[PDB]
Amino acid sequence: LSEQLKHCNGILKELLSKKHAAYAWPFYKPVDASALGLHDYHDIIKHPMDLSTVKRKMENRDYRDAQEFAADVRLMFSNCYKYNPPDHDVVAMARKLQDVFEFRYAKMPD
Numbered sequence: 001l002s003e004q005l006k007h008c009n010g011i012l013k014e015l016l017s018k019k020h021a022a023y024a025w026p027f028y029k030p031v032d033a034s035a036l037g038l039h040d041y042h043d044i045i046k047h048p049m050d051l052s053t054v055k056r057k058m059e060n061r062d063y064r065d066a067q068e069f070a071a072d073v074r075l076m077f078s079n080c081y082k083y084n085p086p087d088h089d090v091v092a093m094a095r096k097l098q099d100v101f102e103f104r105y106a107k108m109p110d
């Protein structure tokens, strides 16, 4: 599972790469609810998550296994699906980035 954590890190790097930037960018940094006018965001979302936070946790060796890492990535998408009207542009972007994630996560080495 050092090997599994390296697969996870590879996924993370891909998610942050220019390849996916057109739909990944809203996930780069924590949602700035204040800035955006989303004054209910932190009443609705108990545990914010974003790719910069996942990167910091990987860098700090916070994740002890692939499943812990995946839980944070899925939390980030679930927060998006919870908060937003399902026709919002950001939800379309979340679906696309999550397709990238789930297909490559599935290729995890034993």
Ligand SMILES: COc1cc(OC)c2c(=O)[nH]c(-c3cc(C)c(OCCO)c(C)c3)nc2c1
Binding pocket: 025, 026, 027, 031, 036, 037, 038, 080, 083, 084, 085, 088, 090
């Ligand atoms: C700039 O990055 C983001 C990332 C986001 O999530 C990962 C979101 C997100 O979850 N919702 C919204 C968002 C923004 C506005 C101004 C909204 O009001 C529409 C008018 O009623 C709504 C419903 C959602 N913007 C994000 C921006």
